[PDB]
Write a protein that binds this ligand. Structure first.
Ligand SMILES: O=P(O)(O)OC[C@@H]1CC[C@@H](O)O1
Ligand SMILES: [Mn+2]
Ligand SMILES: [Mn+2]
Ligand SMILES: [Mn+2]
Length: 391
């Protein structure tokens, strides 16, 4: 192998400007990093700058440097959708024609009618909501009537809440499985069906740890599958395991925050493995992008950038670091959905003694997967062109 370990970091939703097909998505003018840099009156990301972020594109506070630490370019998304699952599946070598759907006005009557017909239960709610808000609103009705609370978030999910002492847990899971089958349909395709059992009483409802997720498997065998099948290590940190429904994963490290994600990254750098360490930093998307909060987004980016010198100090000569994103989620944009954007790509190894250069623009995210596959000598994915030899 040219690299013994590859550390792949997805900064979730950290887009670097509207993509060529942005218009098809109503995403003209979108620019995640750029609008944040403007809001902040200049972003302080000196370590990303040293890697060459500003060389990809200059933005307020983010300037190009003469001798970037690593190689740099941006990546264009080829798949139809702009959701997390699509982006990640493409990164690991897939092409996804069918987008996952979001439901800002709740779910179509047709879907809910079929779920009712298959379960024998009424459905109440049917709107985007936090799990807390929705429980206070409808928790008591749910208890009294044996109804299912069905709701969504700004993401592609269908959540089903039910009191544990009214609807038995195993029945809630059965219902979620029925919903999971019904939602395998392009009309209403959800990335994730989530059981949200709760207990307590009106004015004091708490969601229990008996939560279960029903994700779809990637539409194809990924580069992670191939690494795993060739006895390499595939360490998933954060949401990565869930995003791929565990496919190709040899070890999974739960995280509770961006800083916690960086701690786990540091843990893997202390590990003697051969293969891929794969981190998703999710706060950018879940806490700031969807909530349209450029101030908190900007602070999160600075907090993350400050963690980077430790990562640099720990990389070995045969380690490669890859930093990218999976779409945009511009916090100064209409609505609550993702934005169709280019994503940055930074590729750094301490063995690059002369620094890096610009790479040709990556025409699919799958170039990352192809690079990983070629490095480890596993079967090349169907999509993607490796840039391994450019490094
Ligand atoms: O509002 P909730 O119930 O806390 O969930 C919000 C989203 C739903 C699933 C995950 O995206 O987090
Ligand atoms: Mn838009
Ligand atoms: Mn995402
Ligand atoms: Mn999202």
């Amino acid at each position: 192998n040219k690299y013994k370990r590859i550390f792949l970091v997805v900064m979730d939703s950290v887009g670097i400007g509207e993509a060529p097909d942005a218009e098809q998505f109503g995403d003209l003018g979108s620019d995640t990093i750029g609008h944040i840099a403007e809001h902040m009156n200049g972003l302080q990301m000196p370590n990303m700058v040293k890697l060459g972020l500003g060389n990809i594109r200059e933005m307020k506070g983010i300037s190009k440097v003469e001798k970037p630490l690593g190689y740099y370019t941006k990546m264009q998304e080829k798949s139809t959708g702009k959701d997390t699952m699509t982006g990640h599946w493409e990164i690991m070598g897939l092409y996804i024609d069918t987008p996952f759907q979001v439901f800002p006005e709740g779910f179509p009557k047709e879907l809910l009618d079929e779920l009712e017909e298959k379960t024998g239960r009424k459905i109440i709610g049917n709107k985007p909501a936090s799990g807390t808000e929705i429980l206070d609103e409808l928790g008591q009705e749910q208890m009294e009537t044996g109804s299912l609370i069905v709701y969504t978030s700004a993401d592609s999910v269908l959540q089903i809440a039910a009191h544990e002492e009214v609807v038995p847990l195993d029945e809630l899971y059965k219902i979620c499985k029925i919903a999971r089958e019904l939602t395998l349909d392009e009309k209403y395709m959800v990335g994730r069906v989530i059981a949200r059992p709760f207990v307590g009483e009106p004015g004091n409802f708490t969601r229990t740890p008996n939560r279960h997720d029903y994700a779809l498997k990637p539409f194809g065998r990924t580069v992670m599958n191939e690494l795993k099948d060739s006895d390499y290590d595939v360490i998933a940190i954060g949401k990565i395991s869930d995003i791929y429904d565990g496919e190709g994963v040899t070890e999974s490290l739960r995280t509770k925050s961006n800083m916690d994600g960086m701690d786990k990254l540091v843990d893997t750098l202390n590990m003697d493995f051969t293969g891929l360490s794969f981190l998703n930093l999710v706060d950018f998307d879940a806490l700031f992008g969807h909530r349209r909060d450029p101030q908190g987004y900007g602070e999160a980016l600075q907090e993350y950038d400050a963690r980077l010198p430790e990562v640099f100090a720990k990389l070995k000569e045969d380690d490669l670091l890859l930093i990218t994103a999976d779409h945009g989620n511009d916090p100064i944009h209409p609505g609550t959905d993702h934005t169709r954007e280019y994503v940055p790509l930074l590729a750094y190894s301490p063995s690059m003694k002369e620094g890096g250069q610009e790479l040709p623009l990556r025409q699919t995210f799958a170039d990352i997967g192809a690079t990983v596959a070629e490095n480890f000598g596993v079967k090349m994915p169907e999509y993607g062109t490796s840039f391994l030899n450019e490094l």
